[PDB]
């Protein structure tokens, strides 16, 4: 018996309850990035750059 | 018995309840990125860059 | 008995309940990217860049 | 135009979502009444005694 | 135009979301009444005694 | 236009979200009444005695 990483619970979302009666939502993007309404999300990354809700409006490398 | 990574629970979403009665939603994108309404998502990446809800409005490498 | 990665539960979404009574939704994209209404999604990537809901509005490499 | 009882919506159940993963259930009745697991039920009674989930363990009128 | 009882919404249950992962439930009745697990129920009674979840363990009228 | 009882919303339950992960429940009745787990219930009674979750353990009229 060694149990190196035996019984873990990592990157987990369990048990959620949500209501939304009258939620007007309005976005107007021009040349950018927009990230709305993210809920009950999970992940696990090994040897990588993991971003749940990133928003890079632009990337420019001119030469 | 070694149990190196034996019994894990990683990148998991279990147990969700959602309601939405009258949810007006309106988007208007022009030349960009938009990410709305993400729910109950999970993943696991090994040796990679895993992004759940990314939004890159542009990528430019001119020469 | 070694159990290297024996009994895992990774990249999983189990148990979801959803209702939506009167959900007006309206999108208007012009030359970009739009990602709406994502629910109950899962994946696992080994040696790769796995993105659940990405949105790249443009990619340009001019020469 | 009188509209005495014109456009009603009475005794109604509309819009339900349910999940049950591992629900052990065990009953043991002896000489009585048991009522379990009632969901999404509706009725309308006119000039009567309407009971959705009644449980009378006994009725005795000895003479 | 009189609209005596024209456009009503009475005795209504609309919009429900439920989850139950591992719900052990155990009843043991002896000579009585038991009423468990009632959900999303509606009714309308006119000129009557309407009881949704009643439980009368006994009724006795001896002579 | 009189609108005596025109546009009402009476005896209504709309919009509910519930979760229950590991809910052990155990009842043991002997000669009585028990009422557990009632949720999202509605009714309307006109000219009557309406009780949602009543529990009369006994009724006795001896002569």
Curated annotation (Swiss-Prot), chains A, B, C, D, E, F:
Phosphorylated, predominantly on serine residues. Phosphorylation by CK1 appears to occur on residues distinct from the residue phosphorylated by other kinases. Hallmark lesions of neurodegenerative synucleinopathies contain alpha-synuclein that is modified by nitration of tyrosine residues and possibly by dityrosine cross-linking to generated stable oligomers. Changing residue 14 to A: Impairs copper-binding. It is found in: Cytoplasm; Membrane; Nucleus; Synapse. It comes from the Eukaryota. Highly expressed in presynaptic terminals in the central nervous system. Expressed principally in brain. Sequence repeats lie at residues 6-20, 21-31. The modification Phosphoserine is found at residue 51. Residues 1-31 are annotated as: 4 X 11 AA tandem repeats of [EGS]-K-T-K-[EQ]-[GQ]-V-X(4). Cu cation binds at residue 14. Belongs to the synuclein family. It is linked to Genetic alterations of SNCA resulting in aberrant polymerization into fibrils, are associated with several neurodegenerative diseases (synucleinopathies). SNCA fibrillar aggregates represent the major non A-beta component of Alzheimer disease amyloid plaque, and a major component of Lewy body inclusions. They are also found within Lewy body (LB)-like intraneuronal inclusions, glial inclusions and axonal spheroids in neurodegeneration with brain iron accumulation type 1. Parkinson disease 1, autosomal dominant: A complex neurodegenerative disorder characterized by bradykinesia, resting tremor, muscular rigidity and postural instability. Additional features are characteristic postural abnormalities, dysautonomia, dystonic cramps, and dementia. The pathology of Parkinson disease involves the loss of dopaminergic neurons in the substantia nigra and the presence of Lewy bodies (intraneuronal accumulations of aggregated proteins), in surviving neurons in various areas of the brain. Neuronal protein that plays several roles in synaptic activity such as regulation of synaptic vesicle trafficking and subsequent neurotransmitter release. Participates as a monomer in synaptic vesicle exocytosis by enhancing vesicle priming, fusion and dilation of exocytotic fusion pores. Mechanistically, acts by increasing local Ca(2+) release from microdomains which is essential for the enhancement of ATP-induced exocytosis. Soluble monomer. Homotetramer. A dynamic intracellular population of tetramers and monomers coexists normally and the tetramer plays an essential role in maintaining homeostasis. Interacts with UCHL1. Interacts with phospholipase D and histones. Interacts (via N-terminus) with synphilin-1/SNCAIP; this interaction promotes formation of SNCA inclusions in the cytoplasm. Interacts with CALM1. Interacts with STXBP1; this interaction controls SNCA self-replicating aggregation. Interacts with SNARE components VAMP2 and SNAP25; these interactions allows SNARE complex assembly and integrity. The 'non A-beta component of Alzheimer disease amyloid plaque' domain (NAC domain) is involved in fibrils formation. The middle hydrophobic region forms the core of the filaments. The C-terminus may regulate aggregation and determine the diameter of the filaments. This is Alpha-synuclein. The chain holds residues 37 to 99 of 140 of the full protein.
